[PDB]
Amino acid sequence: LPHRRFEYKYSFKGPHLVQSDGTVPFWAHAGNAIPSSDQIRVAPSLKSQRGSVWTKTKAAFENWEVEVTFRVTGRGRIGADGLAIWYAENQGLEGPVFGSADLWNGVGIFFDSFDNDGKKNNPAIVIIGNNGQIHYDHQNDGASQALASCQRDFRNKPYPVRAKITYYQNTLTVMINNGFTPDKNDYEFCAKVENMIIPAQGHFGISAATGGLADDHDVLSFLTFQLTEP
Ligand SMILES: OC[C@H]1O[C@H](O[C@H]2[C@@H](O)[C@H](O)[C@@H](CO)O[C@@H]2O)[C@@H](O)[C@@H](O)[C@@H]1O
Ligand SMILES: [Ca+2]
Ligand SMILES: [Ca+2]
Numbered sequence: 001l002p003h004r005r006f007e008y009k010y011s012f013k014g015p016h017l018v019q020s021d022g023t024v025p026f027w028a029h030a031g032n033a034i035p036s037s038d039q040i041r042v043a044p045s046l047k048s049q050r051g052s053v054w055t056k057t058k059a060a061f062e063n064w065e066v067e068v069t070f071r072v073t074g075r076g077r078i079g080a081d082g083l084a085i086w087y088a089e090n091q092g093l094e095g096p097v098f099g100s101a102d103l104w105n106g107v108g109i110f111f112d113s114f115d116n117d118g119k120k121n122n123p124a125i126v127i128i129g130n131n132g133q134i135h136y137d138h139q140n141d142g143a144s145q146a147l148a149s150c151q152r153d154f155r156n157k158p159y160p161v162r163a164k165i166t167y168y169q170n171t172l173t174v175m176i177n178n179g180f181t182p183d184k185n186d187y188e189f190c191a192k193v194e195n196m197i198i199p200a201q202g203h204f205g206i207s208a209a210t211g212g213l214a215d216d217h218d219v220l221s222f223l224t225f226q227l228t229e230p
Helices: none
Strands: 003-012 027-031 040-043 049-055 064-073 082-088 105-112 124-131 148-151 161-168 171-177 188-193 203-210 216-228
Touching: 003 049, 040 049, 049 216, 064 082, 082 161, 082 216, 105 161, 124 171, 124 188, 148 188, 161 216, 203 216
Parallel strands: 040 203
Antiparallel strands: 003 216, 027 049, 040 216, 049 203, 064 161, 064 216, 082 105, 082 203, 105 124, 124 148, 161 171, 171 188
């Protein structure tokens, strides 16, 4: 097991997430993102919303882990459109891609709620690498652009969902706790990419959006760790 060192300057959590200025320390909020004390509501359950939180400053970690705790809540069996967890070269503030800009340099892990391509394969968790040249294909849930993916129902859980995403030794892994139980540490394997290269310095980002249907997408915490091989 690599040793995990916490990096607060790249992190946020309650019970006092928003400062009186309305800011969350070390992070920048844009669009329809709403910061509260317990969480950020990155997109509210309204039609056509885009939100996003990014770290102010770049990080140069050879290996890192990010732990993200969230909820996607909707009235109905079906919800839209999802979340995206980001590690890129530049903060991407506005885009068609879950509310963040298209043509990114880095990797986005997308928790896609809505079945655009009507394959009946949603909700899904997708991993997509990009070098600044790709254009994400929404209409297709980016099915053709995935490095890897899993199917996972992250909507309407009794407890918050958590995603543990690790870049260690050129491997990007995604573990999910499905919110079935109060046990925090109950992760199951969702997906991995091997031999993956991403930028040496980057911004850790979170984005959300809604279209014709909408859910509230809330992030309780974002915690970042640098990892060292021991
Ligand atoms: O936000 C859901 C979906 O909304 C829009 O898609 C249309 C299409 O999915 C169907 O005709 C229904 C959905 O109930 O009406 C929508 O207008 C698009 O905005 C799309 O981006 C999004 O996935
Ligand atoms: Ca699909
Ligand atoms: Ca989709």
